Write a protein that binds this DNA or RNA. Sequence first.
DNA 1: GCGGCGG
Length: 144
Amino acid sequence: VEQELATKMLQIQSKRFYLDVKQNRRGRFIKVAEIGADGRRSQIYLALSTAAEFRDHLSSFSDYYASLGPPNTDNLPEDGKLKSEMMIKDYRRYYLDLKENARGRFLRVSQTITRGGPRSQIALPAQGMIEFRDALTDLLEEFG
DNA sequence: GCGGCGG
Ligand SMILES: [Cl-]
Protein backbone atom coordinates (compact mmCIF):
# COMPACT_ATOMS: atom_id res chain seq x y z
CA VAL A 1 0.00 0.00 0.00
CA GLU A 2 2.26 2.76 -1.39
CA GLN A 3 0.65 5.75 -3.01
CA GLU A 4 2.66 7.48 -5.76
CA LEU A 5 2.90 11.26 -5.20
CA ALA A 6 5.42 12.62 -7.78
CA THR A 7 8.11 11.36 -10.15
CA LYS A 8 11.27 12.42 -11.98
CA MET A 9 13.25 10.49 -14.56
CA LEU A 10 16.83 11.27 -15.52
CA GLN A 11 19.02 9.82 -18.26
CA ILE A 12 22.63 9.87 -17.09
CA GLN A 13 25.22 8.30 -19.40
CA SER A 14 24.03 4.69 -19.99
CA LYS A 15 21.76 4.70 -16.94
CA ARG A 16 18.24 5.86 -16.10
CA PHE A 17 17.36 7.15 -12.64
CA TYR A 18 13.88 7.42 -11.22
CA LEU A 19 13.13 9.60 -8.24
CA ASP A 20 9.68 8.79 -6.81
CA VAL A 21 8.01 10.44 -3.84
CA LYS A 22 5.61 7.95 -2.24
CA GLN A 23 3.58 7.47 0.92
CA ASN A 24 2.48 4.48 2.98
CA ARG A 25 0.59 4.21 6.25
CA ARG A 26 3.62 5.25 8.27
CA GLY A 27 4.58 8.17 6.07
CA ARG A 28 6.33 9.71 3.08
CA PHE A 29 9.60 8.69 1.49
CA ILE A 30 11.60 9.01 -1.69
CA LYS A 31 12.57 5.94 -3.67
CA VAL A 32 15.69 6.28 -5.84
CA ALA A 33 16.01 3.65 -8.60
CA GLU A 34 19.00 3.07 -10.87
CA ILE A 35 18.37 1.15 -14.10
CA GLY A 36 21.52 -0.03 -15.87
CA ALA A 37 21.82 -0.20 -19.66
CA ASP A 38 21.16 -3.96 -19.44
CA GLY A 39 17.99 -3.42 -17.39
CA ARG A 40 19.45 -4.29 -13.96
CA ARG A 41 17.62 -2.44 -11.15
CA SER A 42 19.09 -1.08 -7.89
CA GLN A 43 17.01 0.93 -5.39
CA ILE A 44 17.39 2.87 -2.14
CA TYR A 45 14.70 4.39 0.09
CA LEU A 46 15.06 7.71 1.90
CA ALA A 47 13.09 9.57 4.53
CA LEU A 48 12.42 13.12 3.39
CA SER A 49 14.79 14.51 6.01
CA THR A 50 17.53 12.19 4.71
CA ALA A 51 16.70 13.25 1.13
CA ALA A 52 17.24 16.90 2.00
CA GLU A 53 20.57 15.98 3.72
CA PHE A 54 21.54 14.11 0.57
CA ARG A 55 20.58 17.09 -1.61
CA ASP A 56 22.67 19.45 0.56
CA HIS A 57 25.77 17.19 0.41
CA LEU A 58 25.64 16.77 -3.38
CA SER A 59 26.89 20.34 -3.85
CA SER A 60 30.12 19.78 -1.89
CA PHE A 61 30.69 16.54 -3.80
CA SER A 62 30.19 18.42 -7.05
CA ASP A 63 32.51 21.26 -5.94
CA TYR A 64 35.16 18.71 -5.00
CA TYR A 65 34.74 16.81 -8.24
CA ALA A 66 34.98 19.96 -10.36
CA SER A 67 38.39 20.76 -8.84
CA LEU A 68 40.04 17.39 -9.53
CA GLY A 69 42.88 16.81 -11.96
CA PRO A 70 43.70 13.43 -13.53
CA PRO A 71 43.68 10.35 -11.28
CA ASN A 72 46.93 8.96 -10.67
CA THR A 73 47.64 5.42 -10.58
CA ASP A 74 50.63 3.69 -8.96
CA ASN A 75 51.22 -0.02 -9.53
CA LEU A 76 49.05 -1.45 -6.77
CA PRO A 77 45.28 -1.71 -6.81
CA GLU A 78 43.43 1.08 -5.02
CA ASP A 79 40.05 1.50 -3.45
CA GLY A 80 40.33 4.94 -1.97
CA LYS A 81 37.49 7.26 -1.28
CA LEU A 82 38.28 10.70 -2.70
CA LYS A 83 35.63 12.07 -0.36
CA SER A 84 33.18 10.49 2.10
CA GLU A 85 30.13 11.44 4.15
CA MET A 86 27.66 9.37 6.15
CA MET A 87 23.98 9.97 6.96
CA ILE A 88 21.86 8.24 9.59
CA LYS A 89 18.14 7.67 9.96
CA ASP A 90 17.00 5.47 12.83
CA TYR A 91 18.95 2.24 12.33
CA ARG A 92 19.73 2.88 8.67
CA ARG A 93 23.09 4.19 7.55
CA TYR A 94 23.86 5.78 4.21
CA TYR A 95 27.42 6.06 2.93
CA LEU A 96 28.22 8.61 0.22
CA ASP A 97 31.62 7.95 -1.39
CA LEU A 98 33.14 9.76 -4.33
CA LYS A 99 35.38 7.24 -6.06
CA GLU A 100 37.42 6.85 -9.22
CA ASN A 101 38.17 3.83 -11.36
CA ALA A 102 39.01 3.14 -15.01
CA ARG A 103 35.43 4.06 -15.92
CA GLY A 104 35.62 7.56 -14.47
CA ARG A 105 34.60 9.31 -11.25
CA PHE A 106 31.30 8.35 -9.58
CA LEU A 107 29.26 8.81 -6.44
CA ARG A 108 28.58 5.56 -4.62
CA VAL A 109 25.52 5.71 -2.40
CA SER A 110 25.23 2.71 -0.10
CA GLN A 111 22.46 1.84 2.33
CA THR A 112 23.05 -0.63 5.16
CA ILE A 113 21.72 -1.77 8.54
CA THR A 114 23.76 -4.78 9.67
CA ARG A 115 26.69 -6.76 8.26
CA GLY A 116 24.61 -9.88 7.63
CA GLY A 117 21.53 -8.10 6.28
CA PRO A 118 19.90 -6.52 3.22
CA ARG A 119 22.11 -4.03 1.39
CA SER A 120 21.35 -1.60 -1.41
CA GLN A 121 23.52 0.77 -3.46
CA ILE A 122 23.39 3.04 -6.46
CA ALA A 123 26.25 4.42 -8.52
CA LEU A 124 25.89 7.89 -10.04
CA PRO A 125 28.46 9.11 -12.63
CA ALA A 126 30.11 12.25 -11.21
CA GLN A 127 29.04 14.25 -14.28
CA GLY A 128 25.39 13.66 -13.35
CA MET A 129 25.46 14.92 -9.77
CA ILE A 130 24.33 18.49 -10.56
CA GLU A 131 21.37 17.29 -12.65
CA PHE A 132 20.48 14.75 -9.95
CA ARG A 133 20.76 17.39 -7.20
CA ASP A 134 18.46 19.82 -9.02
CA ALA A 135 15.90 17.02 -9.60
CA LEU A 136 15.92 16.19 -5.89
CA THR A 137 15.48 19.91 -5.08
CA ASP A 138 12.41 20.17 -7.31
CA LEU A 139 10.73 17.31 -5.42
CA LEU A 140 11.85 18.62 -2.02
CA GLU A 141 10.27 22.03 -2.79
CA GLU A 142 6.89 20.29 -3.19
CA PHE A 143 7.12 17.95 -0.15
CA GLY A 144 7.93 18.39 3.54
C1' DG B 1 28.92 2.77 -24.41
C1' DC B 2 30.04 1.42 -20.55
C1' DG B 3 30.62 0.61 -15.31
C1' DG B 4 31.52 0.90 -10.31
C1' DC B 5 36.45 -4.82 -5.61
C1' DG B 6 32.68 -9.72 -1.87
C1' DG B 7 32.94 -13.03 1.85
CL1 LIG C 1 11.37 12.67 7.78
